[model samples]
Target: GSSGSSGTATNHQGLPAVDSEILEMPPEKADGVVEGIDVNGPKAQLMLRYPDGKREQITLPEQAKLLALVKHVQSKGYPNERFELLTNFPRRKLSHLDYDITLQEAGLCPQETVFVQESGPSSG
Candidate 1:
């Protein structure tokens, strides 16, 4: 079979098919990666230990301010003026944090365990 050239040059309208399979990402909205992900929403969960050798699990909204945490402890019969919050390991002092800061920014993400220390040295 002898074929002579010159019919029409087909452009093919295509390039290399390099990794084209992944291009068909569905129309669904994509989500974020899981690394260091924000795990929960609405209310948060945390545990507080009192000077009375008691550990109490508490809840605070993710958007709740640090003052809310302080108040929650106060709700357990501890006075904000006489008690302060202390986190373990990193030894963060919530009492020193801005009351306006949210629980998440305060490093009280999904869950954290904190301790309460009583003030008023003269009474001791």
Candidate 2:
């Protein structure tokens, strides 16, 4: 777990923004609770399962898309949960587990990437 939340300068207009604090679930809290989780990094991605067991992934270029997931999950009857970015640059990583096969098949495997900011106080 993080000692405290960290802040970053926005990629736009130099505004300050706090990165979402990562939450660590204790083993006691985590047991048998997680259904499925999918995250793709060096970028942001999310896949969520609804109370009815239906699944959906928000497809967008930024991590902030997680706000949509939060709303969807909550409306589906679950309490708000954390959607932490598990990786970032200098420590950025690609997970074989989340490798985007469609993009790879399209020859965009090594596509150049960049992050431009939107608004802040975000959790995604």
Candidate 3:
């Protein structure tokens, strides 16, 4: 009937220790409406015309560097050689453009053919 301390004076449990009595908590609730976005990877289909009058259609990563395309040409029975990639019209050399530019940004796409010529030293 008589005690030195009361049960409310201290908290001795797994819950927060405080002067006031507290109860165990429940799991948190989740929010609704999960949104989604569309994403696509780079791709390109090219018509490659070799100097030997051979033609082939090749698909490559649009974001790949130009050097990989050069290697692809070599793998197709062509001897290891340096080359100049040219546009169909005005016959501009792709090498004259940025070597570091991506194939997509360089406008190398489907329904178009690019010419390849063996590069040689300048007369100068």
Error (Å) of candidate 1 at residue 21 is: 89
Candidate number achieving the greatest TM-score relative to the actual structure:
1
List candidate 2 segments past 4 Å from native.
1-43, 63-66, 81-124
Residues 24-43, candidate 1, lDDT per residue (tens digit)? Answer: 66675433322223446666
lDDT score for residue 33 of model 3: 33
User: For model 3, how big is the CA root-mean-square deviation?
Assistant: 23.0
| Ten contiguous residues minimizing lDDT sum, candidate 3 | 30-39
lDDT of each: 0.74, 0.35, 0.61
What would you estimate as the lDDT of candidate 1? 0.74
Each prediction's TM-score versus the true structure: 0.59, 0.23, 0.53
Clash count for each candidate, listed in order shown: 0, 0, 0
Question: Model 1 — TM-score against the truth?
Answer: 0.59
- lDDT of model 1 at residue 38? 45
What TM-score would candidate 2 get against the native?
Answer: 0.23
Segments of candidate 1 deviating more than 4 angstroms: 1-42, 120-124
Instruction: Output the number of the lDDT-best candidate.
Output: 1
